Amino acid sequence: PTNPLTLIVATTPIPTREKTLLGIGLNGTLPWPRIKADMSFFARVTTRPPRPGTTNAMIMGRKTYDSVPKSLRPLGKRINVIVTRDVEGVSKRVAEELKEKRAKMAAAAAAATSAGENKEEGPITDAIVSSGLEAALEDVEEKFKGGLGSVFVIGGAEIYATALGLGGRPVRIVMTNVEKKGVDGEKAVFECDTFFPIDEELLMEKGWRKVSAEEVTEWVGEPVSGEWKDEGEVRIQMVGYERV
Numbered sequence: 699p700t701n702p703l704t705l706i707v708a709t710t711p712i713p714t715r716e717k718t719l720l721g722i723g724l725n726g727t728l729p730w731p732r733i734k735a736d737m738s739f740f741a742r743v744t745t746r747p748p749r750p751g752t753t754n755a756m757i758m759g760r761k762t763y764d765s766v767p768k769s770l771r772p773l774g775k776r777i778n779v780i781v782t783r784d785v786e787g788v789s790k791r792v793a794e795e796l797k798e799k800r801a802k803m804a805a806a807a808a809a810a811t812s813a814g815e816n817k818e819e820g821p822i823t824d825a826i827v828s829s830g831l832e833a834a835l836e837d838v839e840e841k842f843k844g845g846l847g848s849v850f851v852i853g854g855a856e857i858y859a860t861a862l863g864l865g866g867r868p869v870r871i872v873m874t875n876v877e878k879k880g881v882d883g884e885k886a887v888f889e890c891d892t893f894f895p896i897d898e899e900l901l902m903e904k905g906w907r908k909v910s911a912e913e914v915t916e917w918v919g920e921p922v923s924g925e926w927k928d929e930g931e932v933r934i935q936m937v938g939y940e941r942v
């Protein structure tokens with residue numbers, strides 16, 4: 699049987715006339731101010747190797763790559779796979795940003811050692827550029843072999859849409875739901891220009907099953923309660939869906 703593909707995503711419900719949409723982005727970033735708990739969950743989950751001496755890959759569209767501030771990409775301790783139609787041109791720039799990322803990480807390692815910090819094994823940092831999502835799955839598999847840990851599809855809408863259309867193989871969605879806290883007991887909505895490519899089929903479990911908190915906990919390797927948690931002016935919860 700074939701290894702599962704995990705979509706990880708934070709969404710916000712937007713009621714429309716015809717149906718609730720799930721908003722994920724505005725103007726090339728996220729629709730909401732920084733949610734610390736979502737970012738740390740995202741960081742921990744996508745970094746955490748499924749067995750010792752492996753490194754997880756994140757596969758992402760080029761715009762999502764661009765959405766991270768430049769000094770913070772490629773994202774550390776994971777293999778970053780950037781999907782594009784301009785492999786040639788994006789490669790050169792990714793190479794450039796990787797090498798700067800390398801410089802930062804090296805200085806930090808030297809400093810930590812100099813500080814007497816107990817160094818240990820851990821996943822590596824890489825970035826490679828592929829011409830498609832299938833190509834990226836192949837590429838990362840060929841490059842890393844048995845050092846490859848789990849594979850996440852981390853967005854955005856075009857790559858997610860591609861992930862969901864792959865010819866069957868398990869696909870699971872780890873989703874953080876994000877909602878403004880009510881004011882005078884009405885809940886305002888986030889403006890988004892980018893949406894998760896499906897919505898209703900998840901909320902009404904049509905071809906999808908919402909799984910137990912226990913199941914998600916197993917997927918992501920840390921306790922997930924699936925309870926709402928207050929984070930300033932938003933509340934958030936983590937859930938999972940598997941295709942049926």
Ligand SMILES: NC(=O)c1ccc[n+]([C@@H]2O[C@H](COP(=O)([O-])OP(=O)(O)OC[C@H]3O[C@@H](n4cnc5c(N)ncnc54)[C@H](OP(=O)(O)O)[C@@H]3O)[C@@H](O)[C@H]2O)c1
Binds near residue numbers: 721782
């Ligand atoms: N809330 C969340 O969890 C979350 C997660 C991720 C992203 N987002 C948000 O979503 C937005 C970006 O999403 P998006 O859909 O606009 O962009 P996207 O899917 O991240 O990237 C689209 C780009 O990826 C490349 N690409 C897409 N389809 C391809 C194909 N079939 N073959 C080859 N290359 C392909 C192309 O790059 P080239 O232009 O270089 O060809 C295309 O322009 C941002 O607002 C981001 O903040 C949110």
Ligand SMILES: C[C@H]1COc2c1c(Oc1cccc(-c3nnn[nH]3)c1)cc1nc(N)nc(N)c21
Binds near residue numbers: 852
């Ligand atoms: C990265 C975007 C794209 O997908 C995601 C991003 C994101 O924002 C950032 C921004 C800047 C840095 C980071 C970051 N820190 N450590 N690792 N990543 C994340 C948050 C996400 N949350 C969920 N639940 N799922 C995703 N697919 C997410």
